[PDB]
Amino acid sequence: MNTFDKHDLSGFVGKHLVYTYDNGWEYEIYVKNENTLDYRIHSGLVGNRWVKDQQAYIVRVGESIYKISWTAPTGTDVSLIVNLGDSLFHGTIFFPRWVMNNPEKTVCFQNDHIPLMNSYRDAGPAYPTEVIDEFATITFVRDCGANNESVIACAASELPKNFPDNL
Amino acid sequence: MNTFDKHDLSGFVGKHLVYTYDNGWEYEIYVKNENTLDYRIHSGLVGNRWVKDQQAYIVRVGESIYKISWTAPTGTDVSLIVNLGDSLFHGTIFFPRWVMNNPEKTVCFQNDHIPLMNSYRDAGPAYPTEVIDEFATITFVRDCGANNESVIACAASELPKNFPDNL
């Protein structure tokens, strides 16, 4: 039994991780503050999609295990587990049916296209929802502090060939 | 490798828990097998709603911590963390707008009304999605074995007055 403050996120805010799911898709997150993340998708169903300033519900569920959940303007729901102590990652993504049908529709810098994402969402089909539930391998972790706009500032296609070895 | 097998669910399958979220809503789950749960809602937004044989995605994310996620015929998405080692529980529920507007429409034994739930889901409005994200206090835990159909078999309103002391 571990005693810890489950409302203290100081062990998680600032974390910058790159990870590959067991379905082969490579993702990247940056925990920007107590209720915000930036993220960047490198490959897979929606490779090259990226997002800044996503509002999220971030909590501590173990001594060194954190959870982060959000809803996207596309209608997608996401809930991730980052177990830093054991270097284990697990993600659940609830995709609307229209995303599964034509995932390229979501591939953009979302911040410049929120009305588009909302329009696609509202047109549907929303259902049936597709649940993607996968462990991932964490391949990179560092601390970039809070509210750092330099961490995720371009699409993955614009990053150096050796990313993140350059870091 | 991890100090535990993340694909081994033997420590979670069969568990029966009752818990109360920090907003006072009381819930109950029974992990029936590796991909199925029954659950029963006692109070809150959708008090007295209950469900059997919900297909779920169940994983181990720490030595004594498990995660269970699913999508409902109503359109709702759920992702729960059960930290047995530290006796910590955290839930995220993504409700469709129509459920927030008329939650009583979902209050039933869902298994008797799946087409109805689908019809409400498809009529919507699906959006905006409302997120309930709360820790809970675990008040009861026991082991009931797998595929035990006696664990959850009535609405909470029909339970004995001293539940779960009778168990």
Automatic annotation (TrEMBL), chains A, B:
<dbReference type="InterPro" id="IPR012674">
    <property type="entry name" value="Calycin"/>
</dbReference>
<feature type="active site" description="Proton donor">
    <location>
        <position position="27"/>
    </location>
</feature>
<dbReference type="Pfam" id="PF05870">
    <property type="entry name" value="PA_decarbox"/>
</dbReference>
<dbReference type="InterPro" id="IPR008729">
    <property type="entry name" value="PA_de_COase"/>
</dbReference>
<feature type="active site" description="Proton acceptor">
    <location>
        <position position="72"/>
    </location>
</feature>
<protein>
    <submittedName>
        <fullName>Ferulic acid decarboxylase</fullName>
    </submittedName>
</protein>
<dbReference type="GO" id="GO:0016831">
    <property type="term" value="F:carboxy-lyase activity"/>
</dbReference>
